[PDB]
From TrEMBL, chain A:
<feature type="transmembrane region" description="Helical">
    <location>
        <begin position="24"/>
        <end position="43"/>
    </location>
</feature>
<keyword id="KW-0472">Membrane</keyword>
<dbReference type="GO" id="GO:0005739">
    <property type="term" value="C:mitochondrion"/>
</dbReference>
<dbReference type="GO" id="GO:0006122">
    <property type="term" value="P:mitochondrial electron transport, ubiquinol to cytochrome c"/>
</dbReference>
<dbReference type="InterPro" id="IPR019182">
    <property type="entry name" value="Cytochrome_b-c1_su10_fun"/>
</dbReference>
<keyword id="KW-0812">Transmembrane</keyword>
<keyword id="KW-1133">Transmembrane helix</keyword>
<protein>
    <submittedName>
        <fullName>YALI0C12210p</fullName>
    </submittedName>
</protein>
<dbReference type="Pfam" id="PF09796">
    <property type="entry name" value="QCR10"/>
</dbReference>
Amino acid sequence: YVKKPSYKIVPHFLGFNIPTVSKWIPIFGIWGAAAGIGALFLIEGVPRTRQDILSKIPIIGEHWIREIPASDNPF
Amino acid sequence: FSTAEAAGVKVAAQDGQSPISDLSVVLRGGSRYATVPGVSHILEKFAFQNTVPKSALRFVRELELFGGKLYTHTTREHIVLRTQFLKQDLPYFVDAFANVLKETKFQQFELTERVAPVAELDLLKRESDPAFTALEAAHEVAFRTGLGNSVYAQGYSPVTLEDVKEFARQVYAKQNVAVVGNNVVPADLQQLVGTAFADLQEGSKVTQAGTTTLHGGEARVRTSTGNALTIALPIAEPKPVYHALASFLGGPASMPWSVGASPLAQATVGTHTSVKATYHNYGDAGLFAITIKGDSPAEISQVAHKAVQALKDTGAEVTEEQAARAYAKSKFAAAEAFENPDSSASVIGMELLSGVSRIAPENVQKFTPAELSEAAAQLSASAKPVVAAVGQVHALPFADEL
């Protein structure tokens, strides 16, 4: 014979609990990647982005190593 | 059902071989005892509201974890509160009933927001059927008070928190409580009820204000939502022969897409009407009713004439075949009533609370054609016929026409 249902209350805050939030952790990860890719794409034109980030990527990085010949540069 | 006693409370249990137990608390608190009109219905709807140890919310959430169900209803004689659960969860349900009887908070907001609105939806759903209305109106005419009180709370007469609290003070007492356990080990229930219901007041037996008096008459409930007619005959001396007579006269078909071979069933041929004879024993008085519903007032009127003729014809002569058919249909009706949990609880509830021994379906008396015809004769020759018309009342029959 059972006298009482068997349960506990999990910690919660603002209607969130750890079981639920843990399911969404991967999703935040992917959104972070999306935001990262997007942000980087938006500043791909910025010379510093090319110099410090994009030109350092192996193989692909030579896409962003471009020199104007001294003969063609007024400045 | 082994009847016993546990700490002043009458406990009946029958062990079985099923994973499902039904535990019912039967209260002597039906509408014949209602201090104020509708208070028994309101008290029924107040069961499993907030108690001091456990809120309504907490109860419902825990009930869902056991997968249990809750059923409540009010009759003229009882309030029945039934829980259905897995056998092993018995202690929880006993304790929950104890909390309800000992420690219900009865808060004004519960009455206004929770209890009264649910009671109102309950009644509106029942009244969607005009036959319900007709049979209720017939009891009102026949008995006036007591058995004539409405079962259900209505808007025109509001029940107050003080009304319900007072009624509960009387009803929720060792003297007015019976516990009925279907598929419950009887020794285990007695032990649990004995510990849980020990501190419940003793109280006193609730009684009907006034003796049951019988009256004839007419009720003409004008609705726009269907048509029905009850022809009732108040009985001063309730006898078991009226069950046999109700089943004999019959009315519903025993077979799909058919009329039926019963006299009342055969009264509906050529019409989209249905008919049902019922007998209501209330111990000290009874009611024999024939209710006819349909969409056509003209057809109802037509059937109503044939219905009273059928009763007169029965008073003349029943055949042996017909008497045997009545025994068979009545034994069956008794059996299925003792099986259905709602009706079962109230049957044993009556035996425990009053003292009316249950008639086992296998002990249902066989009435000779003489005894049946004599019963129908008394009814055809009644000095106090009741007729309740519902719907287009201008087009339905009157008592003096029947």
